[PDB]
Design a protein around this ligand. Structure first.
Ligand SMILES: Nc1nccc(-c2ccccc2)n1
Length: 154
């Protein structure tokens, strides 16, 4: 029914790292770093692995910040996205064929060039709030309906 994904935001006091995907799901959009969780792999281990694969960064300890379930009408599998944040990383962001990373000042987060759901839950992430969300999409751009509530335990 649902498929596990990870999403990692490198969020520091005055800036956040995003990556511009070159192809595939989310191409042409700034997003965090993540992907599918593998068999026998913890969600958190999958989040660390994907951060390195896509951005070249090594994270020390991830913090759970949210869970967002995505529905795309006409697609059978729900996307169960486990969202993490970190402020302590190692390495320098690496641009590859697949991904172009860039730091953004918090007052210049490029929401018009991001998935539209980000405009709803990023304000919570920036104020250190935890959340459970659900977004029903039609295509890649239209949110048909959604729920989003703050939680004390992800
Ligand atoms: N910001 C945002 N919005 C919608 C979907 C996603 C996503 C995250 C991880 C993996 C696949 C999709 N991310």
């Amino acid at each position: 029914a649902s498929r596990l994904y990870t999403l990692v935001l490198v969020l520091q006091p005055q800036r956040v790292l995003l990556g511009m995907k070159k192809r595939g799901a989310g191409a042409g959009r700034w997003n965090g770093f993540g992907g599918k969780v593998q068999e026998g792999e913890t969600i958190e281990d999958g989040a660390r692995r994907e951060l390195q694969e896509e951005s070249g960064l090594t994270v020390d300890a991830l913090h759970k910040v949210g869970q967002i379930v995505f529905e795309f009408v006409g697609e059978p599998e729900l996307m169960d996205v486990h969202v993490f944040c970190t402020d302590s990383i190692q390495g320098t962001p690496v641009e590859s064929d697949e991904m172009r990373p860039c730091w953004f000042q918090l007052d210049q987060i490029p929401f018009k060039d991001m998935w539209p759901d980000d405009s709803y839950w990023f304000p919570l992430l920036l104020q250190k709030k935890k959340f459970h969300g659900y977004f029903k999409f039609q295509g890649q751009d239209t949110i048909l309906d959604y729920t989003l509530r703050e939680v004390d335990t992800v």
